[PDB]
Amino acid sequence: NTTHLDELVKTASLKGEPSDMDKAELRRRQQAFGLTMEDMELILHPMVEDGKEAIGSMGDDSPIAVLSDKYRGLHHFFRQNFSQVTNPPIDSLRERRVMSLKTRL
Amino acid sequence: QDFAEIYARFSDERANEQANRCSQCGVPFCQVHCPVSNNIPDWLKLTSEGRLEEAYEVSQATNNFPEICGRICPQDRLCEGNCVIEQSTHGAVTIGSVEKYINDTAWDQGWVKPRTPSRELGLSVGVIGAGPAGLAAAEELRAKGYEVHVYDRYDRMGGLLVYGIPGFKLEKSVVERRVKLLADAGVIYHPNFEVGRDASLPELRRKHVAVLVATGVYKARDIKAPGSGLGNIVAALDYLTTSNKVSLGDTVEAYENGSLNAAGKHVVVLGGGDTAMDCVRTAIRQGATSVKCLYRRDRKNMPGSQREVAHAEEEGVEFIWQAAPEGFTGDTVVTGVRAVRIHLGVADATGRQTPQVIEGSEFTVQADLVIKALGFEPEDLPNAFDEPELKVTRWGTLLVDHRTKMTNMDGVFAAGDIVRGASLVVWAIRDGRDAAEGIHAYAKAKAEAPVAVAAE
Ligand SMILES: Cc1cc2nc3c(=O)[nH]c(=O)nc-3n(C[C@H](O)[C@H](O)[C@H](O)COP(=O)(O)OP(=O)(O)OC[C@H]3O[C@@H](n4cnc5c(N)ncnc54)[C@H](O)[C@@H]3O)c2cc1C
Ligand code: SF4
Ligand code: SF4
């Protein structure tokens, strides 16, 4: 009795992920939220190309967002939690079949 | 004898090869290491794509003299010094070369550089000296939208770039290209005006909002005493320019029919820095049989960076060079109304590392020609007088705030070699760069209009 609006949704993607902004706009919005080239080159790109995420190296030695000089987005202040001794983390690669991302409305 | 492009760095379209090589690194070290803070990853990426105009634009935005700097910048000391690829077998990217190339194509295009719409328009602003510092300051100011005039003592423009740095390293057409781009801005240059009897800061005060003192270090160092060119002696100040005039076509209307200076027999060049090495190389250009570069100090502490010393070395110039202390020239002997030799004393470094000259040990070096490379400094008293009231430091140079580059007088700013604090084209252009924002803040205040802080 459940409507899986999946196929219905894939359909329209194959029918054309649409774009509607002219590079003159794109850049200014982007600018609003301080986006950058590092942002498009370092990070966005590999996601599209490889279907995967920018791996990098060495520490993070930028200031902490509140102490930053430059505009930094909310998400920078929200740090992700992880579990240490109380519980173990999972292998999302080797054990992907147990995880899941199903969403219901 | 002749001035071909000796630069190793120069690149043909083949620059494409290195452009691809560049890692195009994030928060690149090279840019941080660049005085003007050029966005090297982006301009390089651009050349990789082959869109030379894009890289050229990126280069020019940060430095007005992108061409000259690409050719001249002591990169190892500068941006290339922190190039990450240096860790690799291939070695660091020759950023200077790619900058030259991208710039060169742009020159070929013949595009003119337009003005941004408008700003506090411009009470008269004056800049003294046509060199890198003033040109940079003037162009940024014009970008702001001001009316400005640069008063140049000499008939030629470009400063040391034109006068001294050799054609083989720095083609004259290069400096001409940049000045023209600046000119498109509407900056006006007038050639036979000098900050001295003719022009003074108080004279300028007669109607003039602000002034930038760009004149550099006009004179050279002392020991030669009245010695004449006919006899033998030439200061770098004298020598380089004569070679420049004969060698570079646009520089002067008159053809130096006298031709290149006739330098024959052994030439002794005294100096550790860029000046000495350029004179050594230029000397062979004028027919010198042999050139000796004498250093007071030790070989290890040669002032010029390795790339330039390399040019002299390949050239086969001999470096008599030892001990941190001065092979120091005691005296020049002239017989026959011509210099036969120069007398030196050996010097050596003590634990104190303070230099010692040992009188007992002397060297008589035979030489037909001596060129003194030691350096330059301001000493012309009327020039200094021109400068009043502005405060001078105990280095006898105009004091300026490092950030603002403002002089004791709020209206007057200074930058470049005159500041005595940097001795590179890119730092001089940077000086003008930084000054321009501050002159702008000052003038706008006069306008009663604010400037943010961020500057842009
Ligand atoms: C031989 C030599 C080789 C060099 N090689 C290099 C190199 O390879 N790479 C590099 O980065 N740097 C090099 N430099 C340094 C570089 O040339 C200088 O740092 C730079 O040109 C300084 O710019 P500037 O505008 O301050 O002064 P310049 O000294 O460049 O400009 C001063 C201008 O003021 C004019 N002037 C002088 N007195 C007056 C007055 N009283 N009134 C009006 N106008 C006046 C002069 O005629 C001149 O046009 C070299 C310098 C020398 C001497
Ligand atoms: S972006 Fe700069 S010149 Fe290129 S590899 Fe050398 S450090 Fe990265
Ligand atoms: S202007 Fe900056 S220091 Fe000279 S990136 Fe170019 S050659 Fe290097």
From Swiss-Prot, chain A:
It comes from the Bacteria. Belongs to the glutamate synthase family. Glutamine binds to the large subunit and transfers the amido group to 2-oxo-glutamate that apparently binds to the small subunit. Aggregate of 4 catalytic active heterodimers, consisting of a large and a small subunit. This is Glutamate synthase [NADPH] large chain. It comes from Azospirillum brasilense. The chain holds residues 458 to 562 of 1515 of the full protein.
From Swiss-Prot, chain B:
It is an enzyme of class 1 (oxidoreductase). Keywords: 4Fe-4S, Amino-acid biosynthesis, Glutamate biosynthesis, Iron, Iron-sulfur, Metal-binding, NADP, Oxidoreductase. Signal peptide: none annotated. Its EC number is 1.4.1.13. InterPro entries: DPD_II, FAD/NAD-bd_sf, FAD/NAD-binding_dom, GltD-like, Helical_ferredxn. Pathway: Amino-acid biosynthesis; L-glutamate biosynthesis via GLT pathway; L-glutamate from 2-oxoglutarate and L-glutamine (NADP(+) route): step 1/1; Energy metabolism; nitrogen metabolism. Glutamine binds to the large subunit and transfers the amido group to 2-oxo-glutamate that apparently binds to the small subunit. This is Glutamate synthase [NADPH] small chain. It comes from Azospirillum brasilense.
